[PDB]
Design a protein around this ligand. Structure first.
Ligand code: PIZ
Lengths: 15, 243
């Protein structure tokens, strides 16, 4: 797991 | 805008970002970052340009996440599509910016700033010079074709919704988007540029050139990063090392 993921953070903010 | 634009393209255009707003936001982050640094902690031009590319990529992801079709995919699928095409979208963004706002001999940046190609020619290494030589020629070809905003948004979707991506749950939606956008772009170009009987095919031919440029840009970033020239962790670097 890469909790540090900026891309994941950006995407989960819109779902 | 021409009198005649396909409904699908109208819907894609609605999803576009507000250019003047993106430009301001980026110019601010950048300034503050350089301020309050001692001589030996001041950012190099490379470091500043890296943060600029990073903030442009944030803007691209913000575009994608709220976009028609893309927003219907689960986060895991979205991650896979963006990891596949991130550098291609940055390159496409840069190239279209040159078509709209640029002039011969100079590079127009997302901040509204500009630098002459001749500066790069003298000062930069071989990797960046090759990169810039190819981008300059691609821009020149696109200016010749009269590349426009309708076509630009179609290419963005074709790059994003790539058929080369494996392990998608909803691979069907992706095929559907690729089919529909291809068809709308062909209708658009044939209608609005009828003297250019080959424009559709010529636009598609630019996609492999975009891919080639974004790969050499990745190589360039990679070597700079491992040389210690990248200031801190950022989205650019994350995407570079992924997959
Ligand atoms: C990603 C979206 C597209 C947006 C791109 C738009 C941004 C481009 C406009 C910026 C131009 C502004 C600065 C122009 C001034 C500049 O050209 O001069 C500084 C030169 C220094 O030249 P180089 O960066 O080429 O460094 C050279 C080079 O590494 C040599 O290696 P190679 O010849 O093998 O390539 C190296 O030689 P050695 O291996 O022999 O040591 C050389 O080392 P040395 O000096 O010791 O000989 C090394 O210097 O430029 C720098 O300041 C950085 C250039 C500005 C950054 C340009 C674009 C940065 C964007 C963010 C990174 C790209 C990410 C891409 C993601 C798709």
């Amino acid at each position: 797991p890469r909790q540090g993921s900026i891309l994941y953070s950006l995407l989960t903010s819109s779902k | 805008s021409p009198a005649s634009i396909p409904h699908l393209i109208l819907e894609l255009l609605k999803c576009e970002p507000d250019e003047p707003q993106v430009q301001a936001k980026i110019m601010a982050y950048l300034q503050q970052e350089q301020a309050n640094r001692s001589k030996h902690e001041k950012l190099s031009t490379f470091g500043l340009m890296c943060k600029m590319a990073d903030q442009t990529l944030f803007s691209i992801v913000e575009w994608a996440r709220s976009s028609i079709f893309f927003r219907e995919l689960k986060v895991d699928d979205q991650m896979k599509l963006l990891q596949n095409c991130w550098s291609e979208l940055l390159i496409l963004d840069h190239i279209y910016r040159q078509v709209v706002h640029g002039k011969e001999g100079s590079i127009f940046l997302v901040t509204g700033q500009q630098v002459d190609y001749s500066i790069i020619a003298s000062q930069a290494g071989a990797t960046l010079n090759n990169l810039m030589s190819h981008a300059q020629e691609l821009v020149a070809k696109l200016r010749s074709l009269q590349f426009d905003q309708r076509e630009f948004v179609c290419l963005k979707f074709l790059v994003l919704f790539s058929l080369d991506v494996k392990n998608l749950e909803n691979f069907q939606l992706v095929e559907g988007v690729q089919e529909q956008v291809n068809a709308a772009l062909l209708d658009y170009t044939m209608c609005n540029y009828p003297q250019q009987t080959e424009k559709f095919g010529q636009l598609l031919l630019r996609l492999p050139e975009i891919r080639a440029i974004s790969m050499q840009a990745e190589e360039y970033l990679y070597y700079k990063h491992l040389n210690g020239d990248v200031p801190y962790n950022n989205l650019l670097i994350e995407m570079l090392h992924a997959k």
